[model samples]
Target chain A: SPRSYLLKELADLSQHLVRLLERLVRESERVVEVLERGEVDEEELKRLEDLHRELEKAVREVRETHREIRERSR
Target chain B: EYIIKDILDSQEHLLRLIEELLETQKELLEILKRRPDSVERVRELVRRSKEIADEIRRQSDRNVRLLEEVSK
Candidate 1:
């Protein structure tokens, strides 16, 4: 029963995790790829680039931190 | 004057919910940063969020150990 609580929390977190990745995998990346085909200026293009870099950093930060927290939660 | 020590404590542990608030805010910045199309308003909003909160989080992160140990 005590362990069940742990499982539930892990399951809950995984649900959130999957939904997040699913959205990005299914839709977000596609939008950028299509933008690549159309005309975009340097300014717009750079702005998008800035966002992409930060997002990459953020993802790396997130996965690592989440890993620690889940381990520490025990 | 410095206002550095000035504020909430884990005096009762995360009952203050600072951890959740700080972390979720961080997550918000992360999520929007990943999205495909750069919409106008959300982009600016995320930028402002980072400018203001990034430093504060660094300090908050440091205190988490004390918060957990001291709090019930």
Candidate 2:
């Protein structure tokens, strides 16, 4: 029973890692996107901020997910 | 049996250390995300951010492998 629980936790961590991986892809794209633009200005600033809000959310999600996983894993 | 239990506990410990590393990375990424852009350009700034993102990806791949190890 404990083994099953640990198995599921690792499986879920993998799922979250994959999700974070996708977010990382978008993050690099936007990073290069805004960099190439040469400047952020008002509109681009807002746009990038909004994109990062989602990206940060994903990071926090994965971070929190792993936190929970370990609490129960042992 | 006791040794195996200790091994499992140590593995979990390693996982926790990895979690903290990832969290620290996320916070750094947040700081970078909030960084202002310009061509007056603090210069070295953009280059390092690229490396940070690269490292994040690399660390995450390790997380995947670590998970696989635990699964077995």
Candidate 3:
């Protein structure tokens, strides 16, 4: 049952990760909402984009690592 | 702006979550070393991981698009 247990842990982590990303998305939308109101800060918008890029890279790496592991072990 | 602080906080929380995910990944990798047959179950996890990966990318692109439209 070790395999089942480990997969369950991974599933839980994925769900939690999705929830946090939702939160980040909501918060980011606020920045855009403010911009729509004619309140603009180019520097802050750039910083937010940077954070999004960082998170995207992290997600991509984790997904690819898992894919690679599964492939090589096959 | 205040919104920047809130988003930064969320980003911090997410980065920590990613760290935990990496640790679990290592643990799973170690398990497969002794029992490569367990690889069959790993695909299910990867499927879910790929979904989340796509979700993040989509959201990122949408955020950039909104910023561009609004900043103009």
Candidate 4:
């Protein structure tokens, strides 16, 4: 029963990550829209690049968590 | 049984979203590479994305706590 409870907790956390990813995807798409429409002002592309770097890192955390869970279950 | 299955299914969805995010980033990078230009409005968009990025990191921290809970 404790195992089941932990599983439920993980599922809840996983679902929250899913929600965050959905929100992230929407924001990225919005960025694309503005650029595609030629509505950009003077700016630095490196900022975008840096943002991508960090976002990618954040995503990595989830994958790492998934691995951690798998190893725990075993 | 079903909880594990649900987690596995959710993992698939996560992978799908990751790929979509990658592709979208590629598109944006390509456009930026060719022609880098943006206004204040664009800056706001970038800021918002960064906000989401931090929130995701924090969420991952919560997951780590749950993992620790299991360890205990």
Candidate 5:
């Protein structure tokens, strides 16, 4: 039951992480465009900062989830 | 079950990593697209992005190798 639960959690976590990553990529692209224009809009800058922070948070969460799966698998 | 699980875990990690690298690539491309007007900072960003992307590609290849090994 423990292993089954871990597997299920891993599956769900993986799916969510992938989705988040895709969104992160999209937002990062938009940030790059904003930067390239040599015009820094405050709103765009704020959004970029927020997206970057969110991406970092998601990465950490995914890593932690991955670690838990590894421990449980062992 | 353990082996299969490990494979899935590796794939998941590699996929996410590649996604990040692709984001970096898009950023770099944005800068490089304006190469004549790109600043030193943008150039540096492009170089670093390329390095990260290369590393990601290597890791992705390893992930694929592991999956093949698991299959065998």
Candidate 6:
């Protein structure tokens, strides 16, 4: 079924997103620890910030992708 | 079957949105941790994110329920 295929694809994407989120959560926790312990490494901090920006971009991508999928399905 | 399949596809897409949201929250959580001082602001963002995620999850559940009802 075409609909089934669509659902499956969405689910696969969702699973991937969830996994990425989990990794991001862990990384965020590490960042907090570094901040709290006053052990901020300039390089690491910069890297973390970059990662944060990338994640923000990914969020926008997901939103746009979802919008596209919805429009197609409808 | 086709109608049910379409509904399922919609629900799946909604689930993907929620998943994306959860990812966003995770990243936001990282930001919160880094700037513990901004706990209040982060909390606000998390609260909103959770609300949206919950809404979508509930909607998906409702769709599944409706499909079942129709089937029966």
Best by DockQ: 2
Q: Which of the CAPRI classes, incorrect, acceptable, medium or high, describes model 6?
A: incorrect
Candidate 3 global CA lDDT score:
0.45
**Comparing 2 and 3 on TM-score, the stronger one:** 2
Between which residue pairs do clashes occur in model 4? A40-B38, A41-B38, A41-B39
Model 6: lDDT of residue A50: 67
Q: Count the clashes in each prediction.
A: 0, 0, 0, 3, 0, 1
Residues A1-74, candidate 4, lDDT per residue (tens digit)? 55555555555555565555555456555655666687655344555566666656666665665666566655
**What are the runs in model 6 whose C-alpha is more than 4 Å off?**
A57-74, B1-72
| Candidate 3 per-residue C-alpha lDDT over A1-74 given as tens digits, one digit per residue, 9 for 90 to 100 | 33334334334444545655554444444544454456655664555456555556656654553354344334
Q: Give the least accurate 10-residue stretch of model 3 chain B, judged by summed lDDT.
A: B63-72
What ranking emerges by lDDT with the best candidate at the front? 5, 6, 4, 2, 3, 1
What candidate 5 gets wrong by more than 4 Å, as runs, is A35-39, B1-5, B8-72
True C-alpha contacts between chains kept, each model in order? 0.00, 0.07, 0.00, 0.11, 0.00, 0.07
**Pairwise TM-score winner, candidates 1 and 4:** 4
* Ten residues in sequence with the least summed lDDT for candidate 6 chain B: B63-72
Please, what are the lDDT tens digits per residue for candidate 5 over residues A37-60? 866556755565566566566666
Writing each residue's lDDT as its tens digit, candidate 2 over A9-71 gives 645654565455445445544554565565535464445456456555655555565555556
DockQ (Cα-based) for each candidate: 0.03, 0.21, 0.02, 0.14, 0.15, 0.17
How does model 6 fare in lDDT?
0.56
Order candidates by DockQ, high to low: 2, 6, 5, 4, 1, 3
Two-chain DockQ for model 4: 0.14
Error of 2 at A12 (Å): 7.2
- Which residue runs does candidate 3 get wrong by more than 4 Å? A1-9, B1-72
